[PDB]
Structure 1
Protein backbone atom coordinates (compact mmCIF):
# COMPACT_ATOMS: atom_id res chain seq x y z
CA UNK A 1 0.00 0.00 0.00
CA UNK A 2 1.92 3.01 -1.36
CA UNK A 3 -1.14 5.28 -1.34
CA UNK A 4 -3.31 2.99 -3.34
CA UNK A 5 -5.46 3.99 -0.31
CA UNK A 6 -7.04 6.73 -2.42
CA UNK A 7 -8.49 4.25 -4.94
CA UNK A 8 -9.66 1.33 -2.79
CA UNK A 9 -11.77 3.48 -0.43
CA UNK A 10 -13.55 5.30 -3.28
CA UNK A 11 -14.49 1.98 -4.93
CA UNK A 12 -16.09 0.40 -1.84
CA UNK A 13 -17.68 3.76 -0.94
CA UNK A 14 -19.24 4.40 -4.36
CA UNK A 15 -20.33 0.72 -4.61
CA UNK A 16 -22.18 1.09 -1.29
CA UNK A 17 -24.02 4.35 -1.95
CA UNK A 18 -25.08 3.39 -5.50
CA UNK A 19 -28.71 2.08 -5.94
CA UNK A 20 -29.29 -1.72 -5.97
CA UNK A 21 -29.23 -3.31 -9.45
CA UNK A 22 -27.29 -0.30 -10.74
CA UNK A 23 -23.57 0.33 -11.06
CA UNK A 24 -21.84 3.44 -9.58
CA UNK A 25 -20.60 6.43 -11.59
CA UNK A 26 -16.81 6.21 -12.00
CA UNK A 27 -13.66 6.54 -10.00
CA UNK A 28 -10.89 7.79 -12.26
CA UNK A 29 -7.19 6.93 -12.22
CA UNK A 30 -3.95 7.89 -13.89
CA UNK A 31 -2.70 4.67 -12.30
CA UNK A 32 -2.68 1.89 -14.88
CA UNK A 33 -1.04 -0.41 -12.36
CA UNK A 34 -2.81 -2.22 -9.57
CA UNK A 35 -3.83 -5.87 -9.43
CA UNK A 36 -7.52 -6.54 -10.15
CA UNK A 37 -8.95 -8.20 -7.07
CA UNK A 38 -12.28 -9.79 -6.03
CA UNK A 39 -13.28 -6.84 -3.79
CA UNK A 40 -12.84 -4.38 -6.71
CA UNK A 41 -15.42 -6.23 -8.85
CA UNK A 42 -18.70 -4.46 -9.68
CA UNK A 43 -17.09 -1.01 -9.71
CA UNK A 44 -16.53 1.04 -12.85
CA UNK A 45 -13.17 2.68 -13.38
CA UNK A 46 -11.91 5.21 -15.93
CA UNK A 47 -8.25 4.80 -16.79
CA UNK A 48 -6.13 7.64 -18.23
CA UNK A 49 -4.30 6.88 -21.47
CA UNK A 50 -2.57 9.96 -22.76
CA UNK A 51 -5.67 12.16 -22.67
CA UNK A 52 -8.68 9.93 -22.49
CA UNK A 53 -10.34 8.07 -19.63
CA UNK A 54 -11.58 4.82 -21.12
CA UNK A 55 -14.16 3.40 -18.75
CA UNK A 56 -14.44 -0.31 -18.07
CA UNK A 57 -16.59 -2.52 -15.88
CA UNK A 58 -14.64 -4.92 -13.66
CA UNK A 59 -15.49 -8.61 -14.10
CA UNK A 60 -14.61 -11.44 -11.66
CA UNK A 61 -12.89 -13.02 -14.69
CA UNK A 62 -10.31 -10.20 -14.90
CA UNK A 63 -8.72 -10.91 -11.49
CA UNK A 64 -4.92 -11.16 -11.42
CA UNK A 65 -4.52 -8.83 -14.44
CA UNK A 66 -3.68 -5.11 -14.38
CA UNK A 67 -6.01 -2.19 -15.12
CA UNK A 68 -3.88 -1.00 -18.04
CA UNK A 69 -4.44 -4.08 -20.21
CA UNK A 70 -8.09 -3.12 -20.70
CA UNK A 71 -7.37 0.38 -21.98
CA UNK A 72 -5.30 0.91 -25.12
CA UNK A 73 -3.16 3.94 -25.76
CA UNK A 74 -2.78 3.99 -29.53
CA UNK A 75 -5.00 3.71 -32.61
CA UNK A 76 -4.73 0.06 -33.89
CA UNK A 77 -3.36 1.28 -37.24
CA UNK A 78 -4.60 1.71 -40.78
CA UNK A 79 -2.84 2.24 -44.07
CA UNK A 80 -2.02 3.64 -46.23
CA UNK A 81 -0.99 4.20 -49.82
CA UNK A 82 2.80 4.22 -49.88
CA UNK A 83 4.14 7.77 -50.03
CA UNK A 84 6.84 9.32 -52.20
CA UNK A 85 10.35 8.42 -51.05
CA UNK A 86 8.78 5.19 -49.84
CA UNK A 87 11.30 3.49 -52.12
CA UNK A 88 14.26 3.64 -54.50
CA UNK A 89 12.28 5.50 -57.16
CA UNK A 90 10.95 8.70 -55.59
CA UNK A 91 12.91 11.73 -56.84
CA UNK A 92 13.05 14.60 -59.35
CA UNK A 93 10.63 17.45 -60.06
CA UNK A 94 12.30 20.43 -61.73
Structure 2
Protein backbone atom coordinates (compact mmCIF):
# COMPACT_ATOMS: atom_id res chain seq x y z
CA UNK A 1 0.00 0.00 0.00
CA UNK A 2 2.71 2.46 1.05
CA UNK A 3 5.23 2.97 -1.75
CA UNK A 4 8.69 2.15 -0.46
CA UNK A 5 11.63 4.54 -0.64
CA UNK A 6 15.15 3.12 -0.71
CA UNK A 7 16.80 4.71 2.29
CA UNK A 8 15.64 8.18 1.24
CA UNK A 9 15.27 7.89 -2.55
CA UNK A 10 12.84 6.06 -4.84
CA UNK A 11 13.42 3.47 -7.54
CA UNK A 12 13.59 5.58 -10.71
CA UNK A 13 15.72 8.39 -9.27
CA UNK A 14 18.01 5.80 -7.69
CA UNK A 15 18.37 3.96 -11.01
CA UNK A 16 19.17 7.22 -12.84
CA UNK A 17 22.42 7.68 -10.93
CA UNK A 18 25.88 6.11 -10.92
CA UNK A 19 28.17 4.42 -8.40
CA UNK A 20 29.87 7.70 -7.43
CA UNK A 21 26.72 8.59 -5.46
CA UNK A 22 25.31 5.08 -4.96
CA UNK A 23 28.28 4.22 -2.73
CA UNK A 24 27.44 7.06 -0.34
CA UNK A 25 23.77 6.11 -0.66
CA UNK A 26 24.24 2.61 0.77
CA UNK A 27 26.43 1.36 3.63
CA UNK A 28 30.21 1.07 4.05
CA UNK A 29 31.05 -2.64 3.76
CA UNK A 30 29.67 -2.93 0.22
CA UNK A 31 31.45 0.31 -0.72
CA UNK A 32 34.78 -1.52 -0.54
CA UNK A 33 33.35 -4.03 -3.03
CA UNK A 34 33.97 -1.40 -5.73
CA UNK A 35 36.14 1.28 -4.07
CA UNK A 36 39.44 -0.62 -4.23
CA UNK A 37 39.36 -0.60 -8.03
CA UNK A 38 37.68 -1.87 -11.15
CA UNK A 39 36.31 -5.39 -10.67
CA UNK A 40 37.90 -7.60 -13.34
CA UNK A 41 39.84 -10.27 -11.40
CA UNK A 42 36.99 -12.79 -11.18
CA UNK A 43 34.23 -10.40 -12.31
CA UNK A 44 34.29 -11.30 -16.01
CA UNK A 45 31.47 -13.72 -15.20
CA UNK A 46 29.69 -10.95 -13.29
CA UNK A 47 29.96 -8.59 -16.27
CA UNK A 48 28.62 -11.36 -18.51
CA UNK A 49 25.72 -11.66 -16.06
CA UNK A 50 25.06 -7.92 -16.29
CA UNK A 51 25.05 -8.10 -20.09
CA UNK A 52 22.69 -11.09 -20.02
CA UNK A 53 20.30 -9.32 -17.63
CA UNK A 54 20.33 -6.15 -19.75
CA UNK A 55 19.59 -8.28 -22.83
CA UNK A 56 16.03 -7.55 -23.91
CA UNK A 57 13.64 -10.28 -22.71
CA UNK A 58 10.08 -10.95 -23.90
CA UNK A 59 7.24 -9.07 -22.25
CA UNK A 60 7.19 -11.39 -19.23
CA UNK A 61 9.51 -12.65 -16.51
CA UNK A 62 13.02 -12.68 -18.05
CA UNK A 63 15.15 -15.76 -18.67
CA UNK A 64 17.05 -17.58 -15.92
CA UNK A 65 20.85 -17.72 -15.76
CA UNK A 66 22.77 -20.46 -13.94
CA UNK A 67 25.99 -19.54 -12.13
CA UNK A 68 28.45 -21.32 -9.85
CA UNK A 69 29.07 -18.14 -7.83
CA UNK A 70 27.36 -16.62 -4.79
CA UNK A 71 29.46 -13.46 -4.58
CA UNK A 72 27.49 -10.78 -6.45
CA UNK A 73 26.34 -7.47 -4.99
CA UNK A 74 22.73 -6.67 -5.82
CA UNK A 75 22.73 -3.53 -7.96
CA UNK A 76 19.54 -1.88 -9.25
CA UNK A 77 20.56 -2.57 -12.86
CA UNK A 78 19.45 -6.21 -12.54
CA UNK A 79 16.38 -6.13 -10.26
CA UNK A 80 13.41 -8.08 -11.57
CA UNK A 81 15.64 -10.63 -13.28
CA UNK A 82 15.68 -14.37 -12.59
CA UNK A 83 19.02 -16.03 -11.81
CA UNK A 84 19.94 -19.57 -10.83
CA UNK A 85 22.17 -19.67 -7.74
CA UNK A 86 24.40 -22.72 -7.18
CA UNK A 87 23.48 -23.31 -3.55
CA UNK A 88 26.14 -25.99 -3.08
CA UNK A 89 24.38 -28.70 -5.09
CA UNK A 90 21.69 -27.34 -7.44
CA UNK A 91 21.08 -24.04 -9.21
CA UNK A 92 18.11 -23.02 -7.07
CA UNK A 93 15.64 -20.57 -8.57
CA UNK A 94 15.45 -17.34 -6.57
CA UNK A 95 12.96 -14.47 -6.37
CA UNK A 96 14.02 -10.86 -5.84
CA UNK A 97 12.27 -7.54 -5.23
CA UNK A 98 13.40 -3.89 -5.48
CA UNK A 99 14.16 -3.98 -1.74
CA UNK A 100 17.26 -6.11 -2.43
CA UNK A 101 19.41 -3.10 -3.37
CA UNK A 102 22.59 -2.64 -1.35
CA UNK A 103 22.89 -6.19 0.03
CA UNK A 104 24.82 -9.36 -0.78
CA UNK A 105 23.53 -12.31 -2.86
CA UNK A 106 24.23 -15.66 -1.21
CA UNK A 107 22.18 -15.10 1.95
CA UNK A 108 19.17 -17.11 0.68
CA UNK A 109 20.74 -20.51 1.42
CA UNK A 110 19.43 -23.00 3.98
CA UNK A 111 22.27 -24.97 5.54
CA UNK A 112 20.80 -28.46 5.96
CA UNK A 113 17.10 -28.55 7.07
CA UNK A 114 14.85 -26.98 9.74
CA UNK A 115 15.70 -29.22 12.70
Q: TM-score, normalised by structure 2?
A: 0.52
Q: Retained in 2: the 8 A contact 1:47–1:71?
A: no
CA distance in 1 between counterparts of 2:73 and 2:45 reads 12
Task: Report the alpha carbon displacement of residue 38 of structure 1 after superposing the two structures with TM.
Answer: 0.3
SS of the residue aligned with 2:112? coil
Whole-angstrom distance in 2 between the partners of 1:50 and 1:6: 21
Contact between 1:40 and 1:58, CA under 8 Å: does it hold in 2? no
Please report the RMSD computed on the Cα atoms of aligned residues, expressed in angstroms: 2.3
In the alignment, is residue 9 of structure 1 matched against residue 9 of structure 2? no
Q: Any gaps of 5 or more consecutive residues in structure 2? A: 1-38
| Kept in 2: contact 1:14–1:24 (CA 8 A) | no
User: C-alpha displacement at 1:21, in angstroms?
Assistant: 3.2
Structure 1 spans left out of the alignment, 5+ residues: 78-94
Residues 19 and 29 of structure 1: CA distance in aligned 2, closer, same or farther (over 3 Å)? closer
TM-score normalized by the length of structure 1: 0.61
Q: Distance in 2 between matches of 1:8 and 1:16?
A: 12
Match of 2:114 in 1: 76
C-alpha change, 1:59 and 1:11, in structure 2 (3 Å) is farther
**Greater Rg over alpha carbons, structure:** 1
